[PDB]
Amino acid sequence: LGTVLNQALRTDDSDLLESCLQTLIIQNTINRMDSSLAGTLLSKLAARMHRRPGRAFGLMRWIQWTLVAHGGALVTQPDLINRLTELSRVLEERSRGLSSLLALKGKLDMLDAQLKYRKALKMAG
Amino acid sequence: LGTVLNQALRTDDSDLLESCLQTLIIQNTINRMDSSLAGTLLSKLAARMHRRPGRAFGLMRWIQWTLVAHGGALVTQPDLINRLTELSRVLEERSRGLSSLLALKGKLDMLDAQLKYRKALKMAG
Amino acid sequence: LTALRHRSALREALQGRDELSVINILRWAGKYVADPRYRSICVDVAFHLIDLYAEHVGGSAELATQFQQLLAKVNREVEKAELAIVTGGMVESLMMSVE
Amino acid sequence: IISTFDIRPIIAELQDIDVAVGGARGAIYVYSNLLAHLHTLRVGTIQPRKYHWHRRAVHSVKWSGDGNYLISGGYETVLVLWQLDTGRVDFLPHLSAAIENIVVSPKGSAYALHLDDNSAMVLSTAEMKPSMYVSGIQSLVLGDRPSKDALVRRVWRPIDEIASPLVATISPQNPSHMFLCVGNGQQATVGGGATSTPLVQVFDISSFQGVAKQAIARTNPTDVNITSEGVPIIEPTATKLAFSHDGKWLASIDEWQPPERDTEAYLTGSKTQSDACKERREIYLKFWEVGADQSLELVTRINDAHYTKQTESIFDLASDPTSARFATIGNDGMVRFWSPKLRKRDGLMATRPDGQPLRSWSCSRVVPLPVHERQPYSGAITFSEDGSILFAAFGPPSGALVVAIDTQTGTVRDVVSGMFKGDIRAMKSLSSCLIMLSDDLVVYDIVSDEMLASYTLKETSEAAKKLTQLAVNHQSRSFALAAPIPKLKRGTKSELLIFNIEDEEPKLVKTFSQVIISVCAVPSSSGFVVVDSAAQVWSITEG
Amino acid sequence: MDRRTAVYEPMAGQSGRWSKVFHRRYHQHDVKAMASFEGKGMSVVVSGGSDASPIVLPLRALGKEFHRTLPHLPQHPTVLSAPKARYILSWWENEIRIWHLLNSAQQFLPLNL
Amino acid sequence: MAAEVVPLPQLKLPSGPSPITAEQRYWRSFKKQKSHTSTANWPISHISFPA
Amino acid sequence: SWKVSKPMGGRMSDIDPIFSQDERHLIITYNTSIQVYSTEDSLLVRRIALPLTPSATHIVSSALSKSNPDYLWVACSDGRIWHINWTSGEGVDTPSTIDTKKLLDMAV
Amino acid sequence: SWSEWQNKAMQADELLQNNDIQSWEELMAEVFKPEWEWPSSRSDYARVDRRWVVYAINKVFGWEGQNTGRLTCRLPESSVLIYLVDAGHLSTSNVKSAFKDDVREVDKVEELIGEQLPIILAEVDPTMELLVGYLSGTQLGSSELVSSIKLLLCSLGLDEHRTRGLGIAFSKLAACPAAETVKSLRRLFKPDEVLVLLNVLRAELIKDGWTTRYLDIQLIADLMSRCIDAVGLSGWMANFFSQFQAEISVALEGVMEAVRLKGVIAEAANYAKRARRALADSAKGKAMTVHMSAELPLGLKTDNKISTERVRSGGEIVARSSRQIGHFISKRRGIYSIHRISEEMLLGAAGPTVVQEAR
RNA sequence: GGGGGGAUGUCCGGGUCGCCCUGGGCACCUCUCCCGGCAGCCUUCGCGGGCAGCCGUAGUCCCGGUUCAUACGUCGCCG
């Protein structure tokens, strides 16, 4: 899908981006993609990130592999730290609730347990 | 192994505890165990916890299932919050480094990537 | 080490190291990151190591393993840090039912 | 730059001189044959010998005795004896602070050392046990001569500054004895910018002499004063410290952190250096048993006396006047009640070799505190005079509130709010009234549930705000305050005010020639005793 | 051998008590030999060490005049080249070494150097 | 009062709620072991000593 | 009703704490306080206060008298000089003004 | 001034027994500094005295002594009351000082106060904008808070002030501590009401959208946790809870990976910034080492420019030399490079163009 | 850093088409004043104040490309 991404990014497509981002080969495409288009990709993926906070599971692995392959491509064209600037601003957003998000987690993994347990009483009774 | 645990706990064995704790059936044993012995079990497992911080993967699942089954058994004999007291003191210990442990994690998952990548250059080159 | 942090010198103590030395210090720090009695100092000196010797890892792969193996243990240390506080809530939260 | 010098004559006449200069660069030049170099348009070459030991400023170089030896005293706490006939240098290395001034006796037999932390010891030469000792109040001083080492723009620049009240107390069961926190010396303490007072001396009020000394935090007197970058090393400093009701226990608490100029590589995202040292602070609570020979012995350190996801900076501590009970409030929101029990694991009693049991204190009770936040707090605490009830000003900015809690039970008796215009500074109890200072100053009775006294203070700078403090007498029901009168410098005047409880009038108005640093209360008698930065103390008494 | 040089003048007055006016760390490696010379308006001492750098010191102007490091390199330049062949070369004891550059500069006007 | 050179003492790290007490150290300190076997593996009825 | 004690204690100045003749007495200069100790017991025998009262004036220099011993000259930031005699307190109330711009140093 | 205020209090008692509420209310307006125009400012109110506040609230509210009395509105339609709302004096300590006499025998006083008051405000204002104002302004305890959010559940379980009040009460109860919250909830709530607010808070999380996908927190954390424990075991005598903790797990793992990538990108960003700096000075000609290729060098080190100052022994500072600077420049030169000199440099105008090998 | 200018090189509408300009992109040298630190001198006990100030960046006759570190008192065996 490498040329697909190249085309879609440089033409600034929307739905082509959606088609290739619905889905290894991912890594191969990020090996074979370009640099400047990858930074623009970074920009609109932080955009999708900011727009709907639903799934992280593919797209973080994506930008992982961007910084894998063409990480130093932003070192090569380092005027776009203003692209890199907002990602800091973007990824500091999703750290927000974590400052006490676990304080939820335990009392909820508490009521998990007896509800598993009184359930684990239930077929026994 | 339920009677095994019962015997070993009330006799305060060491190596019997080791034998049964090397290893589902775990859950069945914790269903079929007793109460007061389970609290003493809790005490020496927090002890092992404090003594060597190597594996959490079985023993946390163990004490999970203790609080599953005979969680309210400590509600039944609630003079032993002093047993429950140190676990707070024990499990606040292993939370220590987490206040910045991730600050390690990323820069290390950074150098992961290109080392995967320049490796992923390597058979290609 | 805690004295060599008390006096701020841990930088200067670290900077004069070679490859084999770095490996030994690395394997040590990896060996003791687990015990929360001193995880503070372990992670700090590891920070200085990464800050001060991460340049030649492309030259020497053997430390890159230990670098990975450093990462590798820690990868399993956040889980222990979480799995504690997973049960960490549980033990505190029984305590509010007893009354 | 000439830091000092000392002459030596060459002889019913004077035939030549040789004069020695010592410089803050860390050098000691000596000039050898002056009178005939200079008596005779043209003169020959002259060239000092250069003798170089110290890194810091030599405070005082003096010719010795015979004129065979050149002795020297410096910051780095070490008195050098230059051999001057060989090349060698033999030296007395461990002093408690900077060697500030030396003089050589009439015969060569004695040295006098004015140790920079306001003391003096007379040595005999080459026996080096101090045949004589006289110490002073050891406190923090607005010193008149600015410095010796601050001449050449050092990395951390020395500023004669004061940033905290001088932490101190008076001892029940020995009212002649005052405990007060101190550093290696004044100059070494204030150096490094921050306060570094990991030490106590106990000092007599009746006869203003030294009595004794001991350590609290980790101290390395045996060590280099300076990290190799060129900076004085900061050493842990005990914020709060108070005395037990019987006269048997002493609770210190120390905080320390790395320097921001060290951290420098812990910066990850928005991590800044203040953030990082603030993360890596250590806060120890140290429980002490009092030896009636004025000695301190540990019973128990607690490493994290207030914990949340980080160690919580601890606001204050207090002593139950009725019983051996200590009290802590910190950054988490919880107040902890500590009590001495016996180290006894399973019935057997662990004893010191005489058979006496290793008593150990422990957090007896735990209370969370009600918080009421409208849209970085603080804390202050005090028992009643009769005990049984503890009063906790918990301190979010201007919105803050005090809570009164019984001691027998952990239930909240009372809670009062709205009584502070800003950040709370401190709070004490008389027999019915809570006196409290934030930006405002308020006496408020609680059994009447009514504010009695209100005083707005004139606006000053934040350092002055930090340096104001108060104290109550508990024998005559009377309290008092202390405040400088408006960046802090040398000549700064303070006023103190004696206030009785029932009236609004200040019962004694008096300013002082300098800024008064600390007020303390004699438990046995009425009155107060005040410590003033130009290091002198005096008492104040009714009657 | 502690790469140090020290300088001596009599303690004036009583007889033959010499003195160590001062010392300095001059070379980079240690000072294996040095010899004096004084005359025809010139008063120097040459210290040659293991770091191959003869330094001249002003004998009578010491503490008063800057020392001078000579080059450790031979005055004859010991490097030659065939510009037509673009062959650079030099020599010492018995080995004569030759490199080729194969390329211009403007071609490169990084990864290929 | 030339304060003496002392090496930096080691720490007293915080101890968890199960240290081997002095007594358990004692009964571990009954150190050396020897297993004398009986005749023909008879089980051992009774041992004792005078006073 | 309440009363203030006289200021006591003091910080040792940075001036030479002079020996006596016969080495038995050490004479030290605190700010606003000159006091003499006997060497053997390390003990005070005299505390001679010196009233300073002009924001920051300080004891500048002081020494034994080289013509006659048991005499102390002392001089402050402003030029006020006392010629007291130890073992005694004679001369506190009788300074002498030197009329300087600013008195920086002195020796006898 | 005590006598003066006591006489003023006597005059207001006279205004009360004359039932001259308008003139009395004007006196209150003068004290607080009918028209009664407002400053559009919760914070910018002038400071008043506790004696006038306490007399005001004593005048406004009522008590019932039967071993357990009851606050009541003696004047339910009062701009002085709504000023007490917007000025946030409505505290338990205030009303305690108000009724120190009759309540000195009563116990559990904060609890009865916090369970009585916001209900009384609610029946005063069914549009409850006064309620959200009281919530937003007054320092609040958890009892008051649970009773208020209960009132909000009655209101719901023209349509924005209520949601605003939900969020504000949520933030405040988040600020509250655990034990007091939990015991208050267990006192004043019923498990079904708790199920309703569970659905509320679930809806809030999924409406923030932590699962509903990309191309397709801490506050509520402390809340939801504390409430379900505050119910606890005796109440629940399933699939709802399992799908609940399913999406909860999805949420927390999204958080976890979010932490991972926040880390890696903050690294990359700071490196990029120092790299931009470095390429700026390299284009300037300060002849450091910058990286060329499209790949990250492992050691993210941007070789800084030399500070013009130096730290000698012992701790002093002076100026670097030009000379020692040139020494360090010689150090920073690599093994091989090209150093093109231009005619303008030969003229003394421009600077050089250098290309070093990739070290 | 900002605010600004004068000048360098550049594309896209372009313009009678040339001097370049406006609209977008700009990176630089130069000038400007407010940022941070430094030093002197007069002032005043001090606090402060005034004065004309440099530097915030690069490569030298040589050359600061330096100077610089904490005592003895007593060793060993085993408990």
DSSP H or E segment with residue D227: strand D226-227
Length of chain A: 125
Q: Which nucleotide is nearest to D222 (CA to C1')?
A: I70
Q: Which residue has the tokens 């002889």?
A: D11
Mind telling me how many Å the CA of D220 is from chain F's nearest CA? Answer: 8
Spatial distance from the CA of D261 to the C1' of I54 (Å): 27
Query: How many whole angstroms from its chain centre is CA A55?
Result: 7
Helix (H, G, I), strand (E, B) or coil at G25: strand
Instruction: Give the C-alpha separation, D459 to D439, whole Å.
Output: 9
For residue H292, give both structure tokens. 């060329």
The distance in angstroms from the start CA to the end CA of chain D is 55
Q: Which amino acid is at H278?
A: A
Residues sharing a CB contact under 8 Å with residue C89, sequence separation 6 or more, in sequence order: A102, A103, A105, A106, A107, A108, A109, A110, H225
- How would you class D220 by CB atoms within 10 Å of its CB: exposed for 0-12, middle for 13-18, buried for 19 or more? middle
Going by C-alpha positions, the residue among H132, H160, H166 that lies closest to residue H42 is: H132
How far is the C-alpha of A37 from the C-alpha of A17, rounded, in Å? Answer: 12
What's chain G's Rg over C-alpha atoms? 14
Whether B9 and B40 have beta carbons less than 8 Å apart is answered as: yes
Nearest to A10 by CA among A47, A45, A43, A40: A40
Q: How was this structure determined?
A: cryo-EM
Query: Exposed e or buried b for every residue in A104-118, given b needs 16+ CB within 10 A?
Result: bbbbbbbbbbbbbbe
Burial of H67 (0-12, 13-18, 19+ CB in 10 A): exposed
Number of other residues whose CB lies within 10 A of the CB of residue H192: 8
What are the C-alpha distances in Å from H102 to residues H54, H56, H66?
Answer: 15, 17, 10
Q: How far is the CA of H327 from the C1' of I4 (A)?
A: 39
Q: Is the CB of H340 under 7 A from strand I?
A: no
Burial G20-47 (b: 16+ CB within 10 A, else e): beeeebbbbbbbbbbbbbebeebeeeeb
Q: Say how many CA atoms lie within 13 Å of B55 toward its Cβ.
A: 8
Nearest to E105 by CA among H350, H355, H292: H355
Do the Cβ atoms of A93 and H218 come closer than 8 Å? no
Phi-psi region for residue G8, left (φ > 0), alpha (ψ -120 to 50) or beta? beta
Pairing of strands H353-356, H337-340: antiparallel
Residue at the smallest CA–C1' distance to nucleotide I62: E68
* Lookup: nucleotide whose C1' is closest to D151 CA: I39
Alpha-carbon span D385 to D539, nearest angstrom = 23
Asked if the bond preceding G79 is cis, omega within 30° of 0, the reply is: no
Nearest to D58 by CA among D158, D151, D165, D170: D151
Contact D33, D16 (CB under 8 A): yes
Question: Rounded to an integer, what is the distance from CA G101 to the centroid of its chain?
Answer: 22
- Residue D91, CB, strand I, below 7 Å: yes
Residue A70 tokens, joined: 């063409």
Q: Which nucleotides of I are covered by protein (CB under 7 A)?
A: 27-29, 38-39, 44-48, 55-60, 62-73
What angle separates helix B98-122 from helix H239-284, to the nearest 10 degrees?
A: 70
Which nucleotide is closest to the Cα of D223 by its C1'? I70
Q: Are D513 and D501 in contact (CB under 8 A)?
A: no
Q: How many other CB atoms are found less than 10 A from the CB of residue H4?
A: 8
Q: How far, in Å, is the CA of A32 from the C1' of nucleotide I33? A: 52
Cα B107 from Cα H267, distance rounded (Å): 7
How far apart are the C-alpha atoms of A40 and A77, rounded to whole Å? 12
Contact partners, residue G98, CB within 8 Å, separation at least 6 = G75, G79, G80, G81
Q: Are D100 and G11 in contact (CB under 8 A)?
A: no
CB C70 within 8 A of CB C26: yes
Q: Cβ distance G90 to G84 under 8 Å?
A: yes
Burial class (CB within 10 angstroms; exposed 0-12, middle 13-18, buried 19+) of F34? exposed
Tell me, yes or no, if D87 comes closer than 8 A to chain E by beta carbon: yes
| Residue labelled with tokens 């593919």 | A58
Q: Is G3 exposed, middle or buried (0-12, 13-18, 19+ CB in 10 A)?
A: exposed
d(CA D178, CA D203): 5
Instruction: Count CA atoms within 13 Å of residue D191 on its CB side.
Output: 27
In whole angstroms, I3 C1' to D364 CA is: 63
Whole-Å CA distances, H182 to H192, H202, H264:
16, 19, 39
Roughly what angle, to the nearest 10 degrees, separates helices H129-137 and H161-175? 30
Q: What is the CA radius of gyration of chain B?
A: 20
Please report, for chain F, how many H helices and E strands are present, in that order. Answer: 1, 0
Nearest to D49 among E17, E19, E64 (CB): E19
3-state helix, strand, coil in chain H (%, to 5): 60, 5, 35
For residue F5, list its beta bridge partners.
Answer: none
**Per-residue flag: H288 CB under 7 A of strand I:** yes
Other Cβ atoms less than 10 A from the Cβ of G54: the count is 10
Distance of CA B13 to the CA centre of its chain: 19
Q: Of the candidates B88, B89, B87, B93, which has an alpha carbon nearest to the alpha carbon of residue B41?
A: B87
- Integer angstrom CA distances of residue D213 from D166, D183, D201, H269: 16, 11, 4, 53
CA distance D336 to D372: 20
What would the two tokens of residue E23 be? 């010392």
Token pair of E28, please?
């980079």
DSSP E28: S
3-state secondary structure of D416: strand
Task: Read off the tokens for B28.
Answer: 């069945």
CA D150 – CA D381 distance, rounded (Å): 40
Is C9 in Cβ contact with D227 (below 8 Å)? yes
Collect all residues of chain B within an 8 Å Cβ-Cβ radius of residue F17: 43, 46-47, 50, 86, 89-90
Judge: D96–F1 Cβ closer than 8 Å, yes or no.
yes
Structural gaps in chain G: residues followed by a C–N separation over 2.5 Å: 53
CA D159 to mean position of chain CA atoms: 16
Residue at D441: amino acid letter:
L
- Cα–Cα–Cα angle for D402, D404, D408, nearest 5°? 155
